[PDB]
Design a protein around this ligand. Structure first.
Ligand SMILES: CN1CCN(c2cccc3nc(-c4n[nH]c5cc(-c6ccc(N)cc6)ccc45)[nH]c23)CC1
Ligand SMILES: CN1CCN(c2cccc3nc(-c4n[nH]c5cc(-c6ccc(N)cc6)ccc45)[nH]c23)CC1
Lengths: 298, 255, 256, 297
């Protein structure tokens, strides 16, 4: 840790802080995630263990690179490539006239390439939200925060705690499915996609039931025809009101015919039929994809 | 993506290999001592209701650690404890706290020792914890059951778990191959059927290619009641595993 | 007795010491041109302090491997090279220049502490794996198959091999053994009109066919040497120690 | 370094000390070579650089294993497998009895296997002397101290300075040859072999000229027929006395006909001197066993 100059604090977390730093010998600008080690009670946190072990298998231009792990006495530092801000702040900054559609298409294309790589390497992210997505001045966007990510060579058990902030959580999870699938990542990305287009969260639920019902009101209450098995799922109630699916032309006005088609496939109710990241990359929506550079307010 | 994942698991299992002959190069410990350790880790898993995957990961970590580090017999259990702790953190939704792992060792080791060994194993394994296991390959194979049979799945898992106990001969087989032999042998024992054509296409393994591993596995299965280590048999006579460890093995495979 | 085993072992180790061929693309602030300037400057420093040619080759191997996994800013590229030359001198020289000398040649652009810290960093990044095979070592081994020895051929082979160090494109994608083989043939052809001998074909397993792609590039580098922006090697090899071989005109064609 | 318990100092050096140590987590007993880093003046010593980089390429049962390198702030530690004592002290302990011949044969056989491996990997040891050779209770002997060792994919230039204590130094070096060859390691091993057999240094010279002359008196003053080129070598003088070669039966009395033949080929003047590999095929080793030594610990 001797060759690093701390530049500024750029992030606060549960197990520790993230600093912008500079390698004094090479000049490389870096993000340092500091983890304080309670050496009486816990040892190395599960989040660090998963994020280090899975991330070092994931070398891809749309996944934030782990450059080094400096593991010592009573501190663990993760050294990452430095990016310039997260998508949430960029969305907020772009409120008085949106992210241009060519940049939205670029970002979704890159995010699906990052995800496809994850999934091909049996890694579930499980926490895709705009503040875990990092952007740079040259027009790149990358997946970050793999603390909740998991290997699925064996199917990953859902919990009753902890994760995917409610707004990006998939219906199967809300309805209490036993195992995660790669469909949950695709769902979250669909919500993020819509949120870029409309400048608002697609499903800003105040609670689990409220989250579910906002989805039902926009996409329609699912039945055994649309989603074989729904009615047998743990947290499904026959009391659920039956709403009608509304036009995507009114849910996402600015999107063209192709855009609506992709989004509907990403928000398909049945996880088995929800579009894969790979299949989404082959969608005609991306046939004219470019890589614009944004104007970040740094 | 289930094809992409099998393909990727096949790639990674060749890279996570420990040294097959490491125990010879090891001055103070033996296969028997390893057998005792692994059997104990099975008990710990039952005591703390840990996933089967956690057990398989922990053993993979122990073999790789012992492939590059000399350990004295009095420290072998500290390696296993740290390995099980790391495997739980990687695989369990909520792992047992460190104090729990200190207590199953009957205070033979301290919290500090266990936490220091955790650091050392992470260093020696270079944080490469997401290893492919027999368990993961079995799980992928189970999706090619026409139709599903829980008694076959339980017996396949039982045989696969028995392979963890004896470094000789199972260290010299890939998890994908051990998994293939366990699946066939369980399938053959319960339903009389054989390694299906769908899995031949998926894995590229024929029944001919599985034969060497199959003959070892069959021999382990026949001698299971006489093995000095019994925690796996005891575990698999439970209702959750349909008492499959009390099933009679086939006298011949007719290969 | 042992020069077969040693050649064999060197062939095994050169496949392992490979840097990433395309590392310069993945590098944000520095370019091939900047690398060319650095290596040319290292040639001067070697002449200034009378360092072995092997030291130069090792230093460049260390720089390419370091830059294969580390991002460096243009203002620190020279610090990497200095530390690399320092380490190569320690490995290869009977007595290397003291650290203060290496601080000297940089015109006080860097400090003693910086150079010593970069030395630690490069040792860590290379994991103390400093005994890399080089074009120099393979040439030396091939020179033992000269019927009979010819110092003009040896000097020209060494000149061409040293020119290969300057241009990452295209020479990063060839093994030292292959570049050596091309340099030997090209020098041998230029001086005596002879070709890659059958004894070396048996020893190396390389045919004149298999050397052709590298030969092609090396011949083109040789023709353009007088026009290259970097000139330290041409200057070095017009000395009498090297029989003024950098003045020998290259053939216009190779007749393959 | 936090997982290592320092047991005792077992060795003192130029750049630092060697401790016997214990891994507190695994119980592994190790030798730790501590190197203090002067971080103003010099950085990592050339000895450590060569020793680390060459030794980690040399995994062989007759070469001491480098287990780890703990490189930090202002300290460099090399972690080695632990052996029980050096050959020099074992020789001293065996003065009133000699090392039995089967153990001598065993030790030479193992040293040649270690050396052959070094040479096949283009490494010159350059400092083979009894105190750099480590033994254990099981009957193993291994090469240690690679501080002066050198890679020779390019020929290794001779020094004015620093080298091979005088007694094991080869004639070409004394006569000022320009390059080392693998023959210098074989020469040293010949001297060590004879010393084990006779219980005395073969050529205990007080100086360079005295060292040469002791060799000449035993082996004969070399001429152009025995060693083509001798008379042209830098430190050769025509004024050198001309001694006759004496019988090996009187230089190494206890050796049989095969032992004498091997030693004479290892002490050949022209660096025609037998290779380690060729020495391993010598009929001297056609009944080699692996006896255990009486180490007086
Ligand atoms: C909520 N936001 C996030 C963005 N923050 C931020 C602001 C300004 C500049 C920033 N640079 C980063 C950053 N660069 N590289 C990173 C890698 C991880 C990482 C950490 C863990 C894993 N597993 C992977 C990547 C997290 C954050 C960063 N984050 C920045 C502000 C606060
Ligand atoms: C002068 N002697 C030497 C033997 N000393 C000694 C006595 C008793 C037990 C000893 N154990 C060692 C030892 N084990 N492993 C070693 C490795 C190196 C090493 C160091 C450097 C390299 N390059 C390789 C191996 C040096 C010394 C030792 N040396 C011992 C007593 C004093």
């Amino acid at each position: 840790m001797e060759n690093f100059q701390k530049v500024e604090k750029i992030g606060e977390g549960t197990y520790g802080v993230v600093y912008k730093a500079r390698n004094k010998l090479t000049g490389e600008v870096v993000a340092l995630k500091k983890i304080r080690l309670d050496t009486e009670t816990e040892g190395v946190p599960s989040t660090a263990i998963r994020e280090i072990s899975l991330l070092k298998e994931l070398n891809h231009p749309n996944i934030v690179k782990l450059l080094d792990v400096i593991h010592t006495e009573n501190k663990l530092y993760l050294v990452f490539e430095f990016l310039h801000q997260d998508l949430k702040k960029f969305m907020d900054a772009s409120a008085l006239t949106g992210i241009p559609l060519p940049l939205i298409k670029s970002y979704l294309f890159q995010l699906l390439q990052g995800l496809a790589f994850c999934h091909s390497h049996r890694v579930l992210h499980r926490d895709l939200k705009p503040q875990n997505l990092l952007i740079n001045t040259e027009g790149a966007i990358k997946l970050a925060d793999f603390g909740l990510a998991r290997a699925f060579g064996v199917p990953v058990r859902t919990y009753t705690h902890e994760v995917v902030t409610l707004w990006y959580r998939a219906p199967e999870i809300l309805l209490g499915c036993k195992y995660y699938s790669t469909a949950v990542d695709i769902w979250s990305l669909g919500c993020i996609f819509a949120e870029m287009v409309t400048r608002r969260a697609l499903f800003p639920g105040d609670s689990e039931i409220d989250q579910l019902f906002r989805i039902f009101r926009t996409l329609g209450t699912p039945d055994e025809v649309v989603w074989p098995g729904v009615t047998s799922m743990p947290d499904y109630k026959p009391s659920f009101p039956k709403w009608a699916r509304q036009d995507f032309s009114k849910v996402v006005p600015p999107l063209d015919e192709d855009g609506r088609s992709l989004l509907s496939q990403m928000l398909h109710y049945d996880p088995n039929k929800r579009i894969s990241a790979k299949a989404a990359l082959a969608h005609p929506f991306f046939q004219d994809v470019t890589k614009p550079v944004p104007h970040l307010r740094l | 993506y289930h094809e992409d994942i099998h393909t990727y698991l096949r790639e990674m299992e060749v890279k996570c290999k420990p040294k097959v002959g490491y125990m010879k190069k090891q001055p103070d410990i033996t296969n028997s001592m390893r057998a005792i350790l692994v059997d104990w880790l099975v008990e710990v898993g039952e005591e703390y209701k840990l996933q089967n995957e956690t057990l398989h990961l922990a053993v993979n970590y122990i073999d790789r650690f012992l492939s590059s580090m000399s350990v004295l017999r009095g420290k072998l259990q500290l390696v296993g404890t740290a390995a099980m702790l790391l495997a739980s953190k990687f695989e369990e939704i909520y792992p047992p706290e460190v104090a729990e792992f200190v207590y199953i060792t009957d205070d033979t080791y301290t919290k500090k020792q266990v936490l220091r060994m955790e650091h050392l194993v992470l260093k020696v394994l270079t944080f490469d914890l997401a290893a492919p296991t027999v368990n993961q390959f079995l799980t992928q194979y189970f999706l090619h059951q026409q139709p599903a049979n829980c008694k076959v799945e339980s017996l396949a898992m039982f045989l696969g778990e028995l392979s963890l106990i004896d470094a000789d001969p199972y260290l010299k087989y890939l998890p994908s191959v051990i998994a293939g032999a366990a699946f066939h042998l369980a399938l053959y024992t319960v339903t009389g059927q054989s390694w299906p054509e769908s899995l031949i296409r998926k894995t590229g393994y024929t029944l001919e290619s599985l034969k060497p591993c199959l003959m070892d596995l069959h021999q382990t299965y026949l001698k299971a009641p006489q093995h000095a280590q019994q925690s796996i048999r005891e575990k698999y006579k439970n209702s959750k595993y349909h008492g499959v460890s009390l099933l009679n093995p086939p006298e011949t495979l007719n290969l």
